[PDB]
Structure formats: C-alpha cells, structure tokens
Amino acid sequence: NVAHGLAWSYYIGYLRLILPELQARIRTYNQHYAVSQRLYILLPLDCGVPDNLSMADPNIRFLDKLPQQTGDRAGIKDRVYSNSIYELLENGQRAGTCVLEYATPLQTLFAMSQYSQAGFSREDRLEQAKLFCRTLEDILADAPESQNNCRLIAYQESSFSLSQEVLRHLRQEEK
Amino acid sequence: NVAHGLAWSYYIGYLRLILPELQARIRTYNQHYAVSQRLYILLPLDCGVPDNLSMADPNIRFLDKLPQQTGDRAGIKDRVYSNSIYELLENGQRAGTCVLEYATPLQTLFAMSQYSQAGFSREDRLEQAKLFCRTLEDILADAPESQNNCRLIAYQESSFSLSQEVLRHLRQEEK
Numbered sequence A, B: 001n002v003a004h005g006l007a008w009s010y011y012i013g014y015l016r017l018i019l020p021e022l023q024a025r026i027r028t029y030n031q032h033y034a035v036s037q038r039l040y041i042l043l044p045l046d047c048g049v050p051d052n053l054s055m056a057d058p059n060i061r062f063l064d065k066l067p068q069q070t071g072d073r074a075g076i077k078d079r080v081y082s083n084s085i086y087e088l089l090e091n092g093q094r095a096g097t098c099v100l101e102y103a104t105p106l107q108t109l110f111a112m113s114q115y116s117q118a119g120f121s122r123e124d125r126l127e128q129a130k131l132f133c134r135t136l137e138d139i140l141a142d143a144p145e146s147q148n149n150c151r152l153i154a155y156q157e158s159s160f161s162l163s164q165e166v167l168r169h170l171r172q173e174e175k
C-alpha cells in the first residue's frame, strides 16, 4: 500500500503549492496573449505515463509555457515550478486550450514494479493506480487550496483518444 | 509504512535523473569560477526541515546556483532541476564549498502527521525518518547512477552545529 503516501506527497509537495497561485498565473498569460482557468491532471489507470505528451496523441500539441513559479524549499534556492499549456486538436481544428499534464507519481509507481528491492509487484499496478486516484480525490475534496482550480482525468484503455477524453472534461466544465 | 515509497520516489524521481549529469554540471561551474564533486543530502531524523537553509545555521551561506537541468517529464516541457551551492563558515572562515540541500520527502513526511485523513500519527515521525534514511541507503548502494556522486548526512539533535556536521563529512571525503 505505497500509493497512499504518493498521493499525499503529490498534494503536499505539488498541489498545495501551485494551486493557490495557479489562477493568478493563468490570468497573467491570458492578458499578454484563451486558456481555461484550471489545471487538468491526467490519470491513466494503466500507469502508462509517456514523458512527451505529444506522442500519446498527435492532436495534443504543445503551445507555450506558463510563467514560472519559484520558492525556497528544503534548502534549494528558487526551486522552479513550471507548467505547459497544450492545444487540443479535433479533425484538424483547435478545439480548446488548457494547462495539461500527467500525474508524475503514476510513473513513479510504474517504475517501482521493475525494481526487486521495492517489493512492489507488477500485478499491483492497476489496484494502486485506482487507490492513488481515489486517495487524491478524497484529498482535493477537503483541500482548501483547491477551489475549483483543478480537474482530474482518470481513464482506462482498442480505439481510444486522449484528446477526446480531455475535451470531454473541457466541454462539461463550460455549463 | 509510507516512508518506503517516499524513499523510492525520491530515487526514481530525483536522484536517478540528476546524479548521472551531476558531476558534469559541477565541472561546468568550477571551470567558469572550488566546489566538491558530490551532492550532500541532509537527513535530520527529527524531521525538522527548514525551507531556508541559512536559518538552520548562520554559518551555512548561499553562494550561487548550479547550471539548471531541464527535461520533458510527464507532459511538462523542460521541467527544471536546479541545486544551490553553499559556503560553510567556521569561526568566521570559509571552511568549504559544496552543493547542499535537505531531503524534501522528510518534510513531506512531516506534514502528513498533521492531516487526519493521512492516518499518519505524530509519534511515528522518528521511526519513519530512520526507515526513509535506511531505505534510501539501501537503494543508493545498488544504484548504478550513484558512483560516489552523493553523500547522505543523517543526524539527531542541547548544542548542535549543522555546519560542523556537514564539515565532518567533507573532511573525511578528502582522504
């Protein structure tokens, strides 16, 4: 049961910090250049987390980075928190724009199954992925930092489109 | 037993990535400006991890940052990995220079004890801190990425000097 600590580390280390300042950083980018107002976190339950989001789906294109967020943390001066903005194509048309990224601990969970010393078996990846997604959902429900500033996209994979899955959450948000 | 996953997340997410390129980044800084050749990770077993290293000890002074390390990870373009270099004073004298930082998961472990939903009790901080330090030691022993490029400083706290503790590991390294 190591997915529980990873979910809390994901909140304590990442989301508790960037979410309060997130909507102010998006308004900064929009005024100089639109992008939706919340961060969309991808949660593939098969634990397949590609490093390059454009390879997962050609219709997901990188556009530009948000302004950086820096702070002194654990002895590191101005540790850099940056997020990438993606345009989601549909039938050759720009169907939306948002800040999109995977949940890094999912791949961190994936890599633990390879190492023998971790004691984490391959068969447990899906169960711990659901637990990570479920524990993260329970955290952000009571999290004061998250006031409708974050959206979690969880899915299981033989035809599938991540652009359509992301666009689904985008369209329903506009209502 | 959540400290086990945090140690592996610390290795998979951070040390597996920066250590292979670490010694090349130090040689870059030294040639333009010396600093020791390995990264010193602070592991206070009381789980007290200040954000500003200069507050922990006045004799630990920030000097300058290393060149950044960037890579595309989990959908984020050019995620920034940066480390701070510190000069350690002794009796008003510069007694050494090295890349120094705390282990971030230690504070991440510390914050989990506050939240009730985490199910992590305050009394377990010391035991999990030792387990995190011990599990991290077992990982870096078999880690091919770590070939004498990293040093772990673990300690327990009524007179104590972190500068003296760090300088102890520095002096013994030179032999």
Ligand SMILES: Nc1ncnc2c1ncn2[C@@H]1C[C@@H]2COP(=O)(O)O[C@H]3C[C@H](n4cnc5c(N)ncnc54)O[C@@H]3COP(=O)(O)O[C@H]2[C@H]1F
Pocket: A009, A010, A012, A013, A014, A076, A079, A080, A081, A082, A104, A105, A108, B009, B010, B011, B012, B013, B014, B076, B079, B080, B081, B082, B103, B104, B105, B108
């Ligand atoms: N660049 C860096 N400098 C210093 N230490 C770093 C580091 N990268 C990693 N580490 C160490 C390894 C450990 C687990 O690394 P991951 O497996 O990537 O899981 C991270 C992913 C997410 N996350 C946090 N910051 C960002 C960000 N800026 N961009 C995108 N995702 C982020 O939050 C999780 C918990 O973060 P943490 O700071 O509590 O623990 C980290 C820290 F101990």
